[PDB]
Structure formats: C-alpha cells, structure tokens
C-alpha cells in the first residue's frame, strides 16, 4: 500500500545515445524537458529513475538503479549512465537541478551498497 | 568546438549559432526550442533561465 517515495524532482531533458546515427537523441522520440524523480521503494530498498514530460506527462524513462551503477557526471549540467542496452543521458535545466539529482543518486547508491 | 544545449551534440566550429551565456544551440536544426512546449524560438520572443528557454510566461511558470 505504501506508495514509492520520490526523493528528488529535477528538470532535465531525458536523452539516449543513438549508435546507428552516432548522436544523442530525445528519449521517447520527442523533444521537451521532463520532471525526473528518483523513486524509492521503502519496503524493498529498490530505486528507479522515472521521468515524465512536463507538457503532457509522457513517461520517457523508467530505469532501475542497480547496486554499482556507474553514475557519470560528464558536464556540470549533463550526467549519464548505462546498462547493457542503452546509455541514458540527463540534460539538466541548470547546475542546481543537476547537483540535486546527483545527491539523490548517491543517496540511493548509499542505501543500495549497504 | 562546442556542444548544443538543445540536443547535446557538437556544433560545427565554423557555423553561426544561438548563444546565451556559456550556452549554445544549433541555429539550423530544431534545437533552440521552448523547454516546455518545444516551440522553435529562432527569431522569436524568448525567456532564458540557466539552460532553459521559454516561449512565454505560461511555459516558464509550468517549469517552476
Ligand atoms: Zn542541437
Ligand atoms: Zn525552426
Ligand atoms: Zn512554450
């Protein structure tokens, strides 16, 4: 019953890297900034990244956070990580959005590495 | 050699581009867009906030 906890809300344009066209592209197929959360399932101590388009709340990312996720703070406003399939990118609206998300990601990883 | 704030890909060093602070966007592809509603803002009224731009006061407040 206990709904998942949102532990941050950042503004980012969610992106994926398109290998066949060797460039970054918008996740879900369309441009626009999303509201991006880290959700914490307090029952199980599992976490996921969920990003919903600001204009229409389309879910463009729904990504589990594993123990040992390598979180790459590539630029001050662009962070990325990968799984076996994709590289995900977050293009933040500002340095504050980015730092707030990164802190929540490290907190998630803190709990996951306990 | 600069990276686009809209699409996160390289901007050709030679071409002209949209600039605001240490942010740049492609001026030829649809990169300079309202962060909310994706409206093209080239030649248009715009409202910049760090790495984001609007469009209008309605799109801006939607992203507060
Ligand atoms: Zn671009
Ligand atoms: Zn245009
Ligand atoms: Zn707009």
Residue contacts between A and B (CB atoms, under 8 Å): 54
DSSP string, chain A: --PPEEEEEEEEEEEEEETTTTEEEEGGGS---EEEEEEEETTTTEEEEEEEETTT--EEEEEE--TT---B--SSSEEEEE-SS-EEEEEESSHHHHHHHHHHHHHHHHHHT-
The answer to whether A68 and A35 have CB atoms below 8 angstroms apart is no
Q: Whole-angstrom Cα distance, residue A52 to residue A33?
A: 8
Q: Which residues of B touch A15 (CB under 8 A)?
A: 8
CB-closest option in A30, A55, A78 to B8: A78
Q: Which residues of B touch A31 (CB under 8 A)?
A: 6, 30, 33, 38
Q: Which residues of A touch B30 (CB under 8 A)?
A: 31
Nearest Cα of chain A lies from the Cα of B16 at a distance, in angstroms, of 20
B1-64 CATH, one of 3.40.50.300, 1.20.1250.20, 2.10.110.10, 3.30.70.3400: 2.10.110.10
**Resolution of the experimental structure, in angstroms:** 2.3
Q: Residue A13: which of A31, A38, A39, A37 has the closest Cα?
A: A31
Please say whether the dihedral angle defined by the alpha carbons of residues B37, B10, B23 and A11, taken in this order, is positive or negative.
positive
Nearest Cα of chain B lies from the Cα of A113 at a distance, in angstroms, of 31
Determine the straight-line distance between the first and last CA of chain A, rounded to whole angstroms: 25
Among all ligands shown, which has an atom nearest to the Cα of B5?
1
Distances in Å between the Cα of B37 and the Cα atoms of A1, A25, B55 are: 35, 17, 8
Q: Which residues of A touch B39 (CB under 8 A)?
A: none
Spell out the domains of chain A, with CATH numbers in brackets: 1-114 (2.30.29.30)
Q: Ligand 2: distance of its center to the CA of B28 in Å?
A: 7
- Three-class DSSP category at B26: strand
The answer to whether A13 and A31 have CB atoms below 8 angstroms apart is yes
Q: Ligand 3: distance of its center to the CA of A47 in Å?
A: 32
């Amino acid at each position: 019953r206990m709904s998942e906890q949102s532990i941050c809300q950042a503004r980012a344009a969610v992106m994926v890297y398109d290998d066949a066209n060797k460039k970054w592209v918008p996740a879900g197929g369309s441009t626009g900034f999303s509201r991006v959360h880290i959700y914490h399932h307090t029952g199980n101590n599992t976490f996921r990244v969920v990003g919903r388009k600001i204009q229409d709340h389309q879910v463009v990312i729904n990504c589990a956070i594993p123990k040992g996720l390598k979180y790459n703070q590539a630029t001050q406003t662009f962070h990325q990580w990968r799984d076996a399939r994709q590289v995900y990118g977050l293009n933040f609206g500002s340095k504050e959005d980015a730092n707030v998300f990164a802190s929540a990601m490290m907190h998630a990883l803190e709990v996951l590495n306990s | 050699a600069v990276v686009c704030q809209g699409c996160h890909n390289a901007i050709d060093p030679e071409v002209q581009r949209v600039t605001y602070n240490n942010f740049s966007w492609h001026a030829s592809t649809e990169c300079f867009l309202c962060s909310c509603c994706s409206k093209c803002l080239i030649g248009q009224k715009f409202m910049p906030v760090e790495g984001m731009v609007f469009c209008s006061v309605e799109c801006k407040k939607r992203m507060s």
